[PDB]
């Protein structure tokens, strides 16, 4: 059975807050297609010979 995710629990209370003291500059990628290959066909040359 696939592991749905890493189990975690955050300590919540109604008078406590958590504030970062440091940062981290991260770089991520993302690939997106734009245009495929333009194609054309010949009717008679294909249907006939």
């Amino acid at each position: 059975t696939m592991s749905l995710g890493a189990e975690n629990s955050v300590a919540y209370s109604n008078n406590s807050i958590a504030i970062p003291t440091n940062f981290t500059i991260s770089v991520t990628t993302e690939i997106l297609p734009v245009s495929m290959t333009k194609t054309s066909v010949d009717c008679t040359m294909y249907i006939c010979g």
Binding site: S40, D42, M45, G49
Partner: protein, 49 residues
């Protein structure tokens, strides 16, 4: 068939007669005389704009 006949380097086996492409059309053929081996290629063609 209509096409251009050129010298071919294909090493036919002695019993082999034709040569077929992906579309099962005779690509390389053996002439009855001289037992020569040829290539059959459609003549130059294309689109006009």
């Amino acid at each position: 068939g209509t096409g251009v006949l050129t010298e071919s380097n294909k090493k036919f086996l002695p019993f082999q007669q034709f040569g077929r492409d992906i579309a099962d059309t005779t690509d390389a053929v053996r002439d009855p005389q001289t037992l020569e081996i040829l290539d059959i290629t459609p003549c130059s063609f294309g689109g006009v704009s």
